[PDB]
Amino acid sequence: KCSLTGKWTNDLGSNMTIGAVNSRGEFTGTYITANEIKESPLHGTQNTINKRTQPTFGFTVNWKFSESTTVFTGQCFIDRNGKEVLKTMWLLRSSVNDIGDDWKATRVGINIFTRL
Amino acid sequence: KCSLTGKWTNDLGSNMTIGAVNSRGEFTGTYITAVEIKESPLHGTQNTINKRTQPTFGFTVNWKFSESTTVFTGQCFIDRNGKEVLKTMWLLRSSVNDIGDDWKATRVGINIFTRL
Amino acid sequence: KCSLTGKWTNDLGSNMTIGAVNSRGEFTGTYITANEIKESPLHGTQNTINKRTQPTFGFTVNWKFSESTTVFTGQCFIDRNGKEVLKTMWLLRSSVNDIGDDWKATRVGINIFTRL
Amino acid sequence: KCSLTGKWTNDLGSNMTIGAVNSRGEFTGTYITAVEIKESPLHGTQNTINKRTQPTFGFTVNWKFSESTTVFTGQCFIDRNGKEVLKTMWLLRSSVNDIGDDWKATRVGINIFTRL
Ligand SMILES: *[C@@H]1O[C@H](CO)[C@@H](O)[C@H](O)[C@H]1NC(C)=O
Ligand SMILES: *[C@@H]1O[C@H](CO)[C@@H](O)[C@H](O)[C@H]1NC(C)=O
Ligand SMILES: *[C@@H]1O[C@H](CO)[C@@H](O)[C@H](O)[C@H]1NC(C)=O
Ligand SMILES: *[C@@H]1O[C@H](CO)[C@@H](O)[C@H](O)[C@H]1NC(C)=O
Which residue ranges traverse the bilayer (chains B, D)? Predict the structure, then answer.
């Protein structure tokens, strides 16, 4: 059973803490990224359908030092060793002033998370 | 100022209904898709920094008919007419059984929403 | 039979010209984007497997006014009317100076193309 | 200066071989994947503007065992050791029959290449 609760570090050095996942898959936590360190809240859910041991999930980071938003989505795996590892991908939405600048406002990438 | 509360419709015919956005930008709603109609819940946050009139935003749909999870993120624009438009991009995470299948698990696309 | 040859305009006002697709799916052309107008070469291929009437395809734009690169990929459709329409998505790779800036160097979006 | 010519291997075990990059940055190669081994051709261009020692780049794989097309794009870095690394993101376009299925046709992911 891979669980989202606990403290995680990613391939980029950023860290996150997720609280308890409730009966409806809902969960909250904080995302911690850099020197001088900033915290931002995050909210999401974990898919509970078929009570999968490696469930999908998604979660929104409400950046508190910029006007941006990032969503992450992925799955909670247990690798060959028995270790919990979060494979995710994200869309970073930047704020743009004009709707004509919309096409360039969304970055994409990966983040792998292990337990800290 | 572009607000997320209300009922929204997108380019694919899917419809969604967002509740009130509290002072920390948090919000809940339901997402409605077909092909016939299933409803799943969604959670997310609207970015509040600088109180922008076209904020960015992002939200997770906890699909209740499948093991999948989708995140959207984008911005709440005002078009040339004065209408409210949501420009979003999404990641659809599918469930895979083995971590070695993770590479093929994430679909990407766009959605544009107007009000109902 | 949807064909990639010809001149196309997209939802963002940009225009492209594609030459003949040869027996190995290979094709070249020029991408034209804005006021003051710039041209950049593009090279790609069209999937020929099963000689599908609506084939997939991909193509790289070698930007000549920046250090960036954009790839597009999609499918050549014939909609209900009988009209050729190119549904595509793209990754815009920006140049970054340091490998530690890699995570933020890739934008994603959509472009729909019709005949000009 | 990071060059693309040679044989490359990525995080998934896939291997590729790129030929010479001519003065306009154009190049050809073959892409090798398994699960057993199929080879498909690839075409693309390396961005030449400002003759950067870590250029961006992008290339289309014309898969010859399926109706699909994948594009990659990224940058040719030099890591702290002095090694050459290709940091890429990709879009995998699947063939769909009806335009109404287009929304679910595009997968996204990452690949990191080192030399053979
Ligand atoms: C990650 O957590 C460790 C230990 O709690 C800490 O040393 C490090 O500074 C954290 N990273 C960030 C970006 O806060
Ligand atoms: C969208 O909402 C309208 C009424 O609010 C309804 O007619 C239609 O069926 C909805 N679309 C879907 C996919 O449920
Ligand atoms: C698109 O093509 C039309 C006609 O050839 C032209 O008026 C327009 O300027 C083109 N767009 C760009 C960005 O070059
Ligand atoms: C990678 O290349 C090596 C030799 O060049 C070979 O052993 C291996 O099978 C290749 N990988 C694939 C997936 O073909």
Answer: none
